Paper text:
[name] neurotoxin A (BoNT/A) targets the soluble N-ethylmaleimide-sensitive factor attachment protein receptor (SNARE) complex, by cleaving synaptosomal-associated protein of 25 kDa size (SNAP-25). The HC, which consists of an N-terminal (HCN) and a C-terminal (HCC) subdomain, is responsible for BoNT’s high target specificity where it forms a dual-receptor complex with synaptic vesicle protein 2 (SV2) and a ganglioside receptor on the surface of motor neurons. Here, we report the high-resolution structure of BoNT/A6 cell binding domain in complex with [name] (HC/A6:[name]), and a new crystal form of HC/A6 [HC/A6 (crystal form II)]. A detailed analysis of these two structures along with a previous HC/A6 structure [HC/A6 (crystal form I)], reveals the interactions that occur across the HC/A6:[name] interface, and the conformational flexibility of HC/A6.
The crystal structure of HC/A6:[name] complex was determined at 1.5 Å resolution by molecular replacement in the monoclinic space group P21 with one molecule in the asymmetric unit. Furthermore, HC/A6 forms seven hydrogen bonds with [name] at Sia5, Gal4, and GalNAc3 through six residues that are conserved among all BoNT/A subtypes. Overall, the conformation of HC/A6 upon binding [name] does not change dramatically except for a flipping of the Phe 1278 sidechain towards Sia5 of [name] and an accompanying widening of loop 1269–1277. However, at the GBS, residue Phe 1278 rotates towards Sia5 and the loop 1269–1277 appears to widen by 4 Å (measured by the difference in Cα position between Arg 1269 and Thr 1277 residues) (magenta). The first is within the SV2 binding site (1139–1157) where residues 1150–1152 in both HC/A6:[name] and HC/A6 (crystal form I) structures form a β-sheet with residues 1003–1006. The raw plot shows higher B-factors overall for the HC/A6 (crystal form II) structure, indicating more flexibility across the entire molecule compared to the HC/A6:[name] structure. For the latter, the HCC subdomain is more flexible than the HCN.
Residue numbers in the entry: 874 to 1167, 1169 to 1225, 1234 to 1295
The structure:
């Protein structure tokens, strides 16, 4: 990263190039920086929503030989209607006089285009489906890396994994733009946006190990993430997804110590014919993470000790258990916050098993997952999980995602 030729970052209260070249950034009047993490840039389908990088003359691409790579993270809202079918739109443009490079999007596609001075084109494409129960890609932060070896191939990587490659040895002189324009160009959906972060340009072909290291290093692994890959936050309502049984959602039979929380039913079907078919995500009891031990910001960090509130009939209850009940599996209840007394409720948050319940002495009661009790999948804390994780890398019932409302998903709250 310290040897990138362009490193676009929000640092010291402004968007600048941190590279040694210090290229000029021109921003339009409708570029939105996420208050929680201002490196997350939102570009709307508006002419004033644009970032233009004016490259130093030293790094403008004009070569038959120079290898180069780009890396960035992108969050692409779900395509909601037929207006998005068959509508390729440019998002990152370094084409001038029908030569250079660009990144483009289409319904279920991320496209890399290289064009030489003879106007010959090579494209590499990542395709993802919107006909999927739970998507890895729709409206979630994904890590893009494109590498170009002028003697061999153009390669697209997604989350550090090679997806597509095409030969480019038959392309000649490439004279790209001296400007890079981040802007939605030719998108017919007026509500479309993208979110982008951590843009870099490199004057080399990155190798698989460098791409994996970049993915790991830009993941911010000390900070817990929500389903969308935004930072997990305190005092923000979350719908819960269990990764072991994703078609079930959380409910509470009754509040109080005699009640329990459990995984039930089937998720709804979100359907727009020929456009998407997904599992509904805004279902079941909402969870809210509350500060207990701690930073003064609202970000949930690895090993933070917290309370979990659950929302039942529009009122907040406390997720808790009597750790003294029979068996390693401790059934969780939703209790009245006042007069909780000495019941076990402190959760250690971990950045897939996120929630380690502790007794008031600071001993592990175990990761929160579930267990079957007479045909009922009750939520439990269980040290069985803690042990199993240390001796296998399988998915367990303690694997959760936290899903807040996000306008890029489009489901009604
Ligand atoms: C399979 C099982 O029951 N495992 C639990 C385990 O049990 C031990 C042993 O494997 C069994 O044979 C069992 O039976 C005894 C019985 O208790 C006695 O009455 C006796 O007379 O008969 C048998 C002995 O002759 O008991 C053994 C230990 O007592 O015990 C451990 C605790 O030591 C757990 O309770 C095991 O159950 C697991 O519990 C955890 C929470 O602790 C989870 O609920 C596990 O479920 C999931 C998961 O959350 O990860 C999810 C699925 O529901 C489950 N799949 C099933 C059950 O079909 C998977 C799956 O087990 C794992 O992925 C392994 O492939 O895990 C839960 O299994």
């Amino acid at each position: 990263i310290n040897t990138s030729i362009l490193s676009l970052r929000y640092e010291n209260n402004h968007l600048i190039d941190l590279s040694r070249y210090a290229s000029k950034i021109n921003i339009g009047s409708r570029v939105n920086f996420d208050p929680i993490d201002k490196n997350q840039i939102q570009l709307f389908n508006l002419e004033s929503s644009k970032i233009e990088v004016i490259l130093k003359n030293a790094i403008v691409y004009n070569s038959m030989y120079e290898n180069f790579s780009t890396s960035f993270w992108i969050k692409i809202p779900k395509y909601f209607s037929e207006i998005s079918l068959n509508n390729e739109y440019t998002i990152i443009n370094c084409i001038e006089n029908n030569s250079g490079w660009k990144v483009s999007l289409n319904y279920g596609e991320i496209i890399w285009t290289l064009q030489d001075n003879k106007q010959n084109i090579q494209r590499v494409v990542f395709k993802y489906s919107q006909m999927v129960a739970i998507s890895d890609y729709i409206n979630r932060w994904i890590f893009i890396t494109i590498t170009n070896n002028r003697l061999t191939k153009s390669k697209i990587y997604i989350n550090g994994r090679l997806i597509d490659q095409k030969p480019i040895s038959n392309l000649g002189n490439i004279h790209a733009s001296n400007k890079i324009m981040f802007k939605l160009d030719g998108c017919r959906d007026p509500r479309r946006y993208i979110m982008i972060k951590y843009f870099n340009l490199f004057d080399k072909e990155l190798n698989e190990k460098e791409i994996k290291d970049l993915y790991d290093s830009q993941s911010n692994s000390g900070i817990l993430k929500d389903f969308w890959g935004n930072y997990l936050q305190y005092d923000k309502p979350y719908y819960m997804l269990n990764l072991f049984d994703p078609n079930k959602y959380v409910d509470v039979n009754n509040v109080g110590i005699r009640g329990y929380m459990y995984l039930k039913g089937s998720r709804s079907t979100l359907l727009t014919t020929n456009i998407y078919l997904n599992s509904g995500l805004y279902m079941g009891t909402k969870f809210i993470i509350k500060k207990y031990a701690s930073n003064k910001d609202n970000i949930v960090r690895n090993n933070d000790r917290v309370y979990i509130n659950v929302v039942v009939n529009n009122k907040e209850y406390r997720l808790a258990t009597n750790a003294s009940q029979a068996g390693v599996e401790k059934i969780l209840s939703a209790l009245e916050i006042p007069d909780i007394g000495n019941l076990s409720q402190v959760v250690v948050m971990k950045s897939k098993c996120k929630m380690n319940l502790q007794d008031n002495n600071g001993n592990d009661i175990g990761f929160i997952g579930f267990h079957k009790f007479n045909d009922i999948y009750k939520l439990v804390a269980s040290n069985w999980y803690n042990r199993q994780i240390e001796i296998s890398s399988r998915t367990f019932g303690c694997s959760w995602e936290f899903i807040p409302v996000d306008d890029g998903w489009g489901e009604k709250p």
